[PDB]
Enzyme design. Structure first.
Site, PDB file in Angstrom:
ATOM      1  CG  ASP A   1      -1.852   1.257   1.221  1.00 15.71           C
ATOM      2  OD1 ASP A   1      -2.089   1.874   0.162  1.00 15.71           O
ATOM      3  OD2 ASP A   1      -2.293   1.626   2.330  1.00 15.71           O
TER       4      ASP A   1
ATOM      5  CG  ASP B   1      -3.727   4.704  -2.173  1.00 17.43           C
ATOM      6  OD1 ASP B   1      -3.269   3.581  -1.897  1.00 17.43           O
ATOM      7  OD2 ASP B   1      -4.550   5.313  -1.454  1.00 17.43           O
TER       8      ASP B   1
HETATM    9  C1  LIG Z   1      -7.874  -2.590  -2.539  1.00 22.90           C
HETATM   10  C2  LIG Z   1      -8.939  -3.618  -2.274  1.00 22.90           C
HETATM   11  C3  LIG Z   1     -10.349  -3.080  -2.514  1.00 22.90           C
HETATM   12  N1  LIG Z   1     -10.633  -1.912  -1.682  1.00 22.90           N
HETATM   13  C4  LIG Z   1     -10.931  -2.091  -0.253  1.00 22.90           C
HETATM   14  C5  LIG Z   1     -12.119  -3.014  -0.049  1.00 22.90           C
HETATM   15  C6  LIG Z   1     -13.381  -2.470  -0.687  1.00 22.90           C
HETATM   16  C7  LIG Z   1     -10.642  -0.696  -2.317  1.00 22.90           C
HETATM   17  O1  LIG Z   1     -10.624  -0.627  -3.545  1.00 22.90           O
HETATM   18  C8  LIG Z   1     -10.673   0.512  -1.475  1.00 22.90           C
HETATM   19  C9  LIG Z   1     -11.727   1.454  -1.657  1.00 22.90           C
HETATM   20  C10 LIG Z   1     -11.727   2.678  -0.930  1.00 22.90           C
HETATM   21  C11 LIG Z   1     -12.803   3.659  -1.144  1.00 22.90           C
HETATM   22  C12 LIG Z   1     -10.679   2.955  -0.005  1.00 22.90           C
HETATM   23  C13 LIG Z   1      -9.630   2.011   0.196  1.00 22.90           C
HETATM   24  C14 LIG Z   1      -8.564   2.304   1.165  1.00 22.90           C
HETATM   25  O2  LIG Z   1      -8.727   3.000   2.173  1.00 22.90           O
HETATM   26  N2  LIG Z   1      -7.375   1.747   0.861  1.00 22.90           N
HETATM   27  C15 LIG Z   1      -6.278   1.882   1.819  1.00 22.90           C
HETATM   28  C16 LIG Z   1      -5.564   0.536   2.019  1.00 22.90           C
HETATM   29  C17 LIG Z   1      -6.570  -0.538   2.381  1.00 22.90           C
HETATM   30  C18 LIG Z   1      -7.387  -0.388   3.538  1.00 22.90           C
HETATM   31  C19 LIG Z   1      -8.344  -1.384   3.870  1.00 22.90           C
HETATM   32  F1  LIG Z   1      -9.130  -1.220   4.938  1.00 22.90           F
HETATM   33  C20 LIG Z   1      -8.481  -2.541   3.053  1.00 22.90           C
HETATM   34  C21 LIG Z   1      -7.663  -2.696   1.897  1.00 22.90           C
HETATM   35  F2  LIG Z   1      -7.798  -3.779   1.127  1.00 22.90           F
HETATM   36  C22 LIG Z   1      -6.707  -1.695   1.560  1.00 22.90           C
HETATM   37  C23 LIG Z   1      -5.299   2.958   1.329  1.00 22.90           C
HETATM   38  O3  LIG Z   1      -5.006   2.726  -0.050  1.00 22.90           O
HETATM   39  C24 LIG Z   1      -5.911   4.356   1.486  1.00 22.90           C
HETATM   40  N3  LIG Z   1      -4.885   5.376   1.206  1.00 22.90           N
HETATM   41  C25 LIG Z   1      -5.376   6.740   1.504  1.00 22.90           C
HETATM   42  C26 LIG Z   1      -5.677   6.966   2.978  1.00 22.90           C
HETATM   43  C27 LIG Z   1      -6.943   7.498   3.369  1.00 22.90           C
HETATM   44  C28 LIG Z   1      -7.236   7.695   4.752  1.00 22.90           C
HETATM   45  C29 LIG Z   1      -6.263   7.360   5.747  1.00 22.90           C
HETATM   46  C30 LIG Z   1      -4.996   6.828   5.360  1.00 22.90           C
HETATM   47  O4  LIG Z   1      -4.082   6.470   6.342  1.00 22.90           O
HETATM   48  C31 LIG Z   1      -2.767   6.979   6.086  1.00 22.90           C
HETATM   49  C32 LIG Z   1      -4.704   6.639   3.969  1.00 22.90           C
HETATM   50  C33 LIG Z   1      -9.626   0.789  -0.541  1.00 22.90           C
END
Ligand SMILES: CCCN(CCC)C(=O)c1cc(C)cc(C(=O)N[C@@H](Cc2cc(F)cc(F)c2)[C@@H](O)CNCc2cccc(OC)c2)c1
EC number: 3.4.23.46
Length: 395
Positions: free
Chosen positions: A41, A237
């Site tokens: 990530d 990201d």
């Molecule tokens: C990737 C697998 C599919 N998923 C998740 C399941 C529906 C998505 O497409 C998805 C969708 C959304 C809409 C947000 C995030 C999301 O928050 N991703 C996280 C990682 C992640 C988290 C999770 F819970 C489950 C996962 F698989 C992957 C980071 O990429 C966010 N970066 C920005 C950020 C935003 C706020 C705070 C921060 O902390 C530094 C970073 C992931």
């Protein structure tokens, strides 16, 4: 001309997974080593692993079995855009089997509670936040993994990602045996891309923030104040599936993409990224969908370059609810209230170089991007672009 050599064979093809569930690399934690699959990530800065039983986990970090385990006597909470977890901080010895031949002591958040974090069938048990300390929880004193890596070894302060989408659905068995890409730690492997590498500045060292200066849908300028494209920020990201766009930009982009693909009418559910659309096997009308070009600030004053993605990137392959022989997909672009997010969807078309040392991010056409006989993804430059600094957003 000159053929480009691949010098990091040991790290090539070390990733697995897919856009919809994330890409992961194998890692080991503790003494003796405990093997775990870890989600890559670039959108977060915490290294965290399941450390207690969970419905979706087949294995987890067992602190009591590690002789090198060190308890930090501190709790940690990390809320993402969607998904969240709570854990206990500590340090221990970490290694990457298919990465540099080194072992380092890094911070590890032992996840004890979570909600909508782990994904059933993703095959990963933790997450590797590759971004900067500024966005690490509890605060910037918790040194990120990659920082520890660089400080403790001779590994160059740089890593590169080749995320490989298959271009078609992968069932549970298939996704486990398939090569999902490459994470080259400490270098750039030339066999992973074609053409040249173009670099855009890392605006600020927190997320991997960049600046978009122009947007085109089939060559047609979206024609918005470039500041809109970066409201309130634009980041690369790997931990998020879709290309996420600021509300106003999303509205403008969808309107343009609809107009370009008007010979075919799609339901509202499709444009909301919620429902899939299908076509008879092999007949997906790629040609009616437009390519999307994103111009990025270049390293030379008043100069930019552009990356062009195909619908093979922004339309994500999904299995039909009836597992038929049709080729189905979901619209992998969605609106954001927190700026632009160049997710896995976009990264699948390019070899992306996170050049930490030179505070820049490079893009090149991926050797594994999905395309057709008529169009290919591209990274082209240079272009004369003025007042690009004004494209950046300031609170
Ligand atoms: C990737 C697998 C599919 N998923 C998740 C399941 C529906 C998505 O497409 C998805 C969708 C959304 C809409 C947000 C995030 C999301 O928050 N991703 C996280 C990682 C992640 C988290 C999770 F819970 C489950 C996962 F698989 C992957 C980071 O990429 C966010 N970066 C920005 C950020 C935003 C706020 C705070 C921060 O902390 C530094 C970073 C992931």
């Amino acid at each position: 001309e000159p053929g480009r050599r691949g010098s990091f064979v040991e790290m090539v093809d070390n990733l697995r997974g897919k856009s919809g569930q994330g890409y992961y690399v194998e890692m080991t934690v503790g003494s003796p080593p405990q093997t775990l699959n870890i989600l890559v990530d670039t959108g977060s800065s915490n290294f965290a692993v399941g450390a207690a039983p969970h419905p979706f986990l087949h294995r987890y970090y067992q602190r009591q079995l590690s002789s090198t385990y060190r308890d930090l006597r501190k709790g940690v909470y990390v809320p993402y855009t969607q998904g969240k977890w709570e854990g206990e901080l500590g340090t221990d010895l970490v290694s990457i089997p298919h990465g540099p031949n080194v072992t380092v002591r890094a911070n590890i958040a032992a996840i004890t509670e979570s909600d909508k974090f782990f994904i059933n069938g993703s095959n990963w048990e933790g997450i590797l936040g590759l971004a900067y300390a500024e966005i690490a929880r509890p605060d910037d004193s918790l040194e990120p993994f990659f920082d520890s890596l660089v400080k403790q070894t001779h590994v160059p302060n740089l890593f590169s990602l080749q995320l490989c989408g298959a271009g078609f659905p992968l069932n549970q068995s298939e996704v486990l045996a398939s090569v999902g890409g490459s994470m080259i730690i400490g270098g750039i492997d030339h066999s992973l891309y074609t053409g040249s590498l173009w670099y855009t500045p890392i605006r600020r060292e927190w997320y991997y923030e960049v600046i978009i200066v122009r947007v085109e849908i089939n060559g047609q300028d979206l024609k918005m104040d470039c500041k809109e494209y970066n409201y309130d920020k634009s980041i690369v990201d790997s931990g998020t599936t879709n290309l996420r766009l600021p509300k106003k930009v999303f509205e403008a982009a969808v309107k343009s993409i609809k107009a370009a693909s008007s010979t075919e009418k799609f339901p509202d559910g499709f444009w909301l990224g919620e429902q899939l659309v299908c076509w008879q096997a092999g007949t997906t009308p790629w040609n009616i969908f437009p390519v999307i070009s994103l111009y990025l600030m270049g390293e030379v004053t008043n100069q930019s370059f552009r990356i062009t993605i195909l619908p093979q990137q922004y339309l994500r392959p999904v299995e039909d609810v009836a597992t038929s022989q049709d080729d189905c997909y979901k619209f992998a672009i969605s609106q954001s209230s927190t700026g632009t997010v160049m997710g896995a969807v976009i990264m699948e078309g390019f070899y992306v170089v996170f050049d930490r040392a030179r505070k820049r991010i490079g893009f090149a056409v991926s050797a594994c991007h999905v395309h057709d006989e008529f169009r290919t993804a591209a990274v082209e430059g240079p272009f004369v672009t003025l007042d690009m600094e004004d494209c950046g957003y300031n609170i």
